[PDB]
Each structure stands twice: as structure tokens, then as C-alpha cells.
Amino acid sequence: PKNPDLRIAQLRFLLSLPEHRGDAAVRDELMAAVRDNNMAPYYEALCKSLDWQIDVDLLNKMKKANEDELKRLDEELEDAEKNLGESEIRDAMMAKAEYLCRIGDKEGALTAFRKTYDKTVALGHRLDIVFYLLRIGLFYMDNDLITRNTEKAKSLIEEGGDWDRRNRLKVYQGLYCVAIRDFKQAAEL
Amino acid sequence: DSSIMMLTSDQKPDVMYADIGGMDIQKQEVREAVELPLTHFELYKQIGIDPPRG
Amino acid sequence: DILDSALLRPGRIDRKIEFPPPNEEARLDILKIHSRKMNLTRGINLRKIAELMPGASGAEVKGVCTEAGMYALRERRVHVTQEDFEMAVAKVMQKD
């Protein structure tokens, strides 16, 4: 649930800086646009890249059908809270709204991050949230929110111990140290 | 301080436990009740259970 | 000695109240009482966690998530799953 949109952000870098690519970068952008049903991302891409021709009803009916998939979840939250099962309710709306926020910008993302912050009792789901801030911070190259989620996660991870996901964070902080200029911490981590 | 004070390993003696394996289930307590209690005080905040001294 | 209490009690002088055996009523909430501090998600089933512990004692509720946590401790996880709780459902009840 990252690499498809991670390639979209890589395609943003392929469109932005070089001005000599007018074909492959927009082609595979549409190839990745027809999937995952992105809305707000293709708006920023519409201003930077070509304005078409026509999108309109195509992605408006795709956002309408995805709204039905959005309204089936958002109208299931009051039907799910009719029953009681602690997590057997909110874990569905925290992850799928972040998939509904994957449709665009930061809104459903940040509002679900602080939403589920008071529920999940395990650090694995909290670090999955951290993964969502790290991917959405990688697409928009925003380093502000990638420090806070990791600073709060490591205290729970290092309380503590891990094998795989600790090496994952080492790659994250290594990608942030190499995003700005840090020569030693990139190779050391 | 005053008495003992500590060591008895680097200054000896020490005896290898790996010879006797019949106590494995008796070590099952000491397994979970020694290493992690010393090396992690943080995990006991995460689990919600306080480490016993018993 | 309760019958020997009657040797001390031809009515003189005390009040007689019985201490109940545990039942599913407390088993739900008194575990939820112990479940305040522990890290657990809200996807745990109260039915099976209660009803899997018939008889036993009130000290049973103490050992529910402790030994379950002990393996989650050993596992290092932040918040646990009911399977590990179901593991200690057997564990503390393996002895009897």
C-alpha cells in the first residue's frame, strides 16, 4: 500500500526537475492514476503536468463510486458502534479511512492518526500509523511530521525491543538523514 | 561500602549449568524471571504488569 | 470451624454472612478492572475470556493476563491478542 503511491511521488520528481521528459513520465502517471483511485494527488499533478483534454466524469464517477465505498464505511461506523467490541470496530475505520485519505491530501490521515492514538494498545499498530506519516511525509517531502511520530514510537519500541521493525526505522531515519545533509548517520544507520 | 563487596565470578568460582538439563522446567521461571526483569524495566510499563521480586 | 463457629454461636455474638464462589458476572468486569493498566486492543471477546474460567478462584483473575503477558513480555509486543490471553486461560488452569 506504499510502492504504488511511492512510485507516484517518484514520478512527481521525474516530472518536476527535468523538463526534457514529456512522454514516459505522464504515461505511467496515468497508468498509476487509473488505479488506487487518487483524487487530490492528480489535482496537483494536473497543474504541474498536462491539463488533458478531459478527465471530468471519468474520475468524478470514480470518486462517486469510491464515495459509495467511502459512504459504506462511514455509514457502517454508526452501525458498528451499535455493537460493542473495543477494537472490533474502530480498527476498520482507522485503516480504511487512511486508505480513503490515500485518495487525497492529509485530512483523513492526520484525523485518523490522532483518532486511533487513544485506542490501540499494541505498538505494532502505532508503528503502522508511523508508517502512514512516513509515506505521506515522503510524498510531500515534509520533514516536520516524520520526526514526531518516530520520536513517540521509539519510546514504545525501545521500552522495549524489536528485530524487523527496528531495522525498518533505521532505514527511515537513514532516509531522513540523507534527505538533508548527513553523511555519517546515513551509512552508520 | 564495607563487606563482601561483590564479584566472585571474575575472581572465581564459576560452574557451567549447561551440563544439567533436567531442571529446564525449573529454569523456566528463572528464564523469564531474571534476564528480561534486569535488562528491561520499560517492558513492565508496556505490559501493565509490575515485575515481582518473588 | 464454620460448624465449630456454631459451637461458639448459639446466637452469641456475631453476624453470619457467606462468601460466594466466583461467577461470570464478576469475571467480565473484575478482569476489566485488572485490564485498566495493561495494553490491549478493544477487539477482545469478553464472552470466551469469562466463560473459559469456571470455578478456579478470585486469584484466577490475577493470573489471567499476567502469565499471558509473561509470554507477550517474552514476545515484547506492546498490546496483546486474546490468543495469548487464551494461552494463559489454559496455563493458570492447567494445574488443577
Overview features:
part of a larger assembly, 3 chains, A: 189 residues, 0% strand, C: 96 residues, hydrolase
Q: How many strands appear in the DSSP assignment of chain C?
A: 0
**Helicity level of chain C:** 55-70%
Which H/E pattern describes the elements of chain C? HHHHH
Q: Which band does the percent of strand residues of chain B land in?
A: under 5%
- Given helix and strand content, the structural type of chain B is mainly alpha
How far is the first residue's CA from the last residue's CA of chain B? 26 Å
Oligomer: part of a larger assembly
What characterizes the major β-sheet of chain B?
none
Radius of gyration of chain C: 18 Å
The rounded Rg of chain B comes to 15 Å
The interface involving the most residues is between: A-C, 19 and 13 residues
Q: What general outline of chain B do the C-alpha atoms trace?
A: flat
Residue share in β-strands of chain C: under 5%
State the helix count of chain B. 2
The total count of strands of chain B amounts to 0
Protein name (chain C): 26S proteasome regulatory subunit 8
Subcellular location (chain C): Cytoplasm; Nucleus
Family (chain C): Belongs to the AAA ATPase family.
Organism (chain C): Homo sapiens (Human)
Topology, please?
The structure is cut from a larger assembly and holds chains A (189 residues), B (54 residues) and C (96 residues).
Chain A: H1 3-16, H2 24-33, H3 40-48, H4 57-74, H5 77-80, H6 87-101, H7 107-116, H8 123-139, H9 145-157, H10 164-179, H11 184-188
Helix pairs in contact in A: 1-2, 4-6, 6-7, 7-8, 8-9
Chain B: H1 24-39, H2 43-47
Chain C: H1 2-8, H2 24-34, H3 46-51, H4 59-75, H5 82-94
Helix pairs in contact in C: 4-5
Structure report:
Chain A has helices at 3-16, 24-33, 40-48, 57-74, 77-80, 87-101, 107-116, 123-139, 145-157, 164-179, 184-188. Helix content of chain A is 69%, strand content 0%. Chain B has helices at 24-39, 43-47. Chain B is flat and about 40 Å long. In chain C, helix 4 (59-75) packs across helix 5 (82-94). Chains in contact: A-B, A-C, B-C. The interface between A and C is medium-sized, with 19 and 13 residues.
